[PDB]
Amino acid sequence: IQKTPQIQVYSRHPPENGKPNILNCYVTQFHPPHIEIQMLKNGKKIPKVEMSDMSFSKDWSFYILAHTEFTPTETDTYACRVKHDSMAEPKTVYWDRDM
Amino acid sequence: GPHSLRYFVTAVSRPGLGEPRYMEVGYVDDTEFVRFDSDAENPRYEPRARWMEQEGPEYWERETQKAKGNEQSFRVDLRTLLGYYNQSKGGSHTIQVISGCEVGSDGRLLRGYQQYAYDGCDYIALNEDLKTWTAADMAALITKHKWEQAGEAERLRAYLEGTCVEWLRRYLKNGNRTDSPKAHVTHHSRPEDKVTLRCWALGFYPADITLTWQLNGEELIQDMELVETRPAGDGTFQKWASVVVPLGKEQYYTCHVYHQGLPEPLTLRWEPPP
Amino acid sequence: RAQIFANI
Numbered sequence A: 001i002q003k004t005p006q007i008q009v010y011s012r013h014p015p016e017n018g019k020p021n022i023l024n025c026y027v028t029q030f031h032p033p034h035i036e037i038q039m040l041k042n043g044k045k046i047p048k049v050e051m052s053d054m055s056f057s058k059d060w061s062f063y064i065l066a067h068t069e070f071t072p073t074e075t076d077t078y079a080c081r082v083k084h085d086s087m088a089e090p091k092t093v094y095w096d097r098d099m
Numbered sequence B: 001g002p003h004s005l006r007y008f009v010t011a012v013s014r015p016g017l018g019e020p021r022y023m024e025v026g027y028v029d030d031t032e033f034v035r036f037d038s039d040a041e042n043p044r045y046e047p048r049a050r051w052m053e054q055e056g057p058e059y060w061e062r063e064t065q066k067a068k069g070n071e072q073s074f075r076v077d078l079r080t081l082l083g084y085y086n087q088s089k090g091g092s093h094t095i096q097v098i099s100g101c102e103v104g105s106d107g108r109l110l111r112g113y114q115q116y117a118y119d120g121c122d123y124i125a126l127n128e129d130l131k132t133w134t135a136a137d138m139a140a141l142i143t144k145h146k147w148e149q150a151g152e153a154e155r156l157r158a159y160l161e162g163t164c165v166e167w168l169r170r171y172l173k174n175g176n177r178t179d180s181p182k183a184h185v186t187h188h189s190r191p192e193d194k195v196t197l198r199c200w201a202l203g204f205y206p207a208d209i210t211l212t213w214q215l216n217g218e219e220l221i222q223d224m225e226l227v228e229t230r231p232a233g234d235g236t237f238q239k240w241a242s243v244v245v246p247l248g249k250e251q252y253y254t255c256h257v258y259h260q261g262l263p264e265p266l267t268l269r270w271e272p273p274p
Numbered sequence C: 001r002a003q004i005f006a007n008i
Helices: B050-054 B057-085 B138-149 B152-175
Strands: A006-011 A021-030 A036-041 A062-070 A078-083 A091-094 B003-012 B021-028 B031-037 B094-103 B109-118 B121-126 B133-135 B182-190 B194-204 B210-215 B237-246 B253-258 B266-268
Touching (some): A006 A078, A021 A078, A036 A062, B003 B057, B021 B152, B031 B050, B031 B057, B057 B094, B109 B152, B121 B138, B133 B138, B138 B152, B182 B253, B194 B210, B194 B253, B210 B237, B237 B253
Antiparallel strands (some): A006 A021, A021 A062, A078 A091, B003 B021, B003 B094, B109 B121, B121 B133, B194 B237, B210 B253, B253 B266
């Protein structure tokens, strides 16, 4: 029995162009626990992504928070990409700065 | 009000890649306060709440050796479950347990419990009576019969009524926080006689919160979009709720924010810059 | 303090 990860991508602070910030990829509701998470800037993998410890909830599903330091600008695109056994292919979720 | 001490345990096999990964994580009232993670040369219990530094080296040593023994038991269990379910030695599998006690403000036990799962499904649970077990399938019946023949329920009841309650009291003593949300409304375009109003709550703790939008004194439930509450990553949480409204009618809608840190709920509207 | 688990 597998559970598909749910993903949110969002900044720690309201984004202001030119101002250093943190970009979060929060991944929840998945099982089994093994998962591979990458963050992507303009289509290319970001090398320094930190991973919180993993935890699980009363319904047995796992959750984890990935993050990277970033300075948003008007035109740069960020995404989080998650590979997990519940899905045939990696899932990519793009950062929407209004969300 | 009531308090709880709970341990969430995970054991995950990885055949051909290494020994199972074992984690033991402790929570006082749902806030993590200790963790052991087997993935290390000389793995040890670590505090996860700063107030835990009050415990001396003997404490950390005892909890570390007990976690190591627990880890080794689950390594055996992972093998046992392959036999019970007639499964291959090649696949990864996961055992999880949640085990703990909830006490009332008077210090009495309200509920002790222990729930196992295998590969994400309920496996066996201790009943409220602290005397019997509920098995979820035929494999868990084997465990049930084994634990019934071994006086396991009495051993576990002694833990839940004794150790669990007593240490919970110690941790509460040693560990005894809200941060109110700050809220604001943003404005974004829609196919363009419509606009989106998004009500944000930021910087709050704990995570529990409620955001609503009202028009003409009633809450909008249809077509209100909400995100699941999410960590900012600094110990605080975020949430938003949004509604699509007619262009020019923004001032007819009100966002209401409800949180335990607030003297009274917040009421706010879109505030166009001067 | 976590309990000592029993083998399943």
